[PDB]
Ligand binder design. Structure first.
Ligand code: R8N
Ligand code: NA
Ligand code: NA
Ligand code: NA
Ligand code: ZN
Length: 258
């Protein structure tokens, strides 16, 4: 009876195994754009993805995950609200059963069809597993997806999904360039928060871009053909693998713009 996204093991259940679910800095949150504080001391985000090395794509039963070689400073995030250097380890998405839902963060209560998370770990902690035990261990870049025109830079990912349909499948996935998933503007909101799946650790500096990318209906439809179950276990479509917004508590969301 492990955690998942259903009636009996979904987000409202998670606190029984992971009591930090009700903690002081949980994610996602609603971004109320009118109360976010402009901070003119926030630096432009530095996203340096030229040397990224993707390795593999994996269905873990919760999402699909594009993993990168993080054994050197290739693809890194710095600047913005960050002190020091954070290394890209992987990305993944959360999405809906319908185009009207699927994002984790919301903007003035608006849900997007999906949300991309590019996960990076602070190189002061030497690897990802040590970094998640620290208050400033991760920086997650979150990008919203709306359904409209196709994102051409997403298509390589979409086309390999049928090869990892079920829980525990991987595939080699080399030479994927994550710059193809970024919108034009790096204007962002930032706040202190957590992982959005168990173990829900409060180790994340969240950076959420204001500008969504658009993807086509066909591209998100293909995300919804994945399965939460393993091969030869009964079919459960991988849809609605998002956690709802959690109480902001004693936090202020900062804006890099306007
Ligand atoms: C914020 N999204 S999340 O909690 O679902 C999530 C995730 F799915 C990940 F896979 C990783 S990195 C796994 C190590 O490679 C991570 F840091 C995350 F925060
Ligand atoms: Na395919
Ligand atoms: Na369409
Ligand atoms: Na079977
Ligand atoms: Zn995520």
């Amino acid at each position: 009876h492990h955690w998942g996204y259903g009636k009996h093991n979904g987000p409202e259940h998670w606190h029984k195994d992971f009591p930090i679910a009700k903690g002081e800095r949980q994610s996602p949150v609603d971004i109320d754009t009118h109360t976010a504080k402009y901070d003119p001391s926030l630096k432009p985000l530095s996203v340096s993805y030229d040397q990224a090395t993707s390795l593999r794509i994996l269905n873990n039963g919760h999402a699909f995950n594009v993993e990168f070689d993080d054994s050197q400073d290739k693809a890194v995030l710095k600047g913005g609200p960050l002190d020091g250097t954070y290394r890209l380890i992987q990305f993944h998405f959360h999405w809906g059963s319908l185009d009207g839902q699927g994002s984790e963060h919301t903007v003035d209560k608006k849900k997007y069809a999906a949300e991309l998370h590019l996960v990076h770990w602070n190189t002061k902690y030497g690897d990802f597993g040590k970094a998640v035990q620290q208050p400033d261990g991760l920086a997650v870049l979150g990008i919203f997806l709306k359904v409209g025109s196709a994102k051409p830079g997403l298509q390589k990912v979409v086309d390999v999904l049928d090869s990892i349909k079920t829980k525990g499948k991987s595939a080699d996935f080399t030479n994927f360039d994550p710059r193809g998933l970024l919108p034009e503007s790096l204007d962002y909101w930032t706040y202190p928060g957590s992982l959005t799946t168990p173990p829900l650790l409060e180790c994340v500096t969240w950076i959420v871009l204001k500008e969504p990318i658009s993807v086509s209906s066909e591209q998100v439809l293909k995300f919804r053909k994945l399965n939460f179950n393993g091969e030869g276990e009964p079919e459960e479509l991988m849809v609605d693998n998002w956690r709802p917004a959690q109480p902001l508590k004693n936090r202020q969301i900062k804006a890099s713009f306007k």
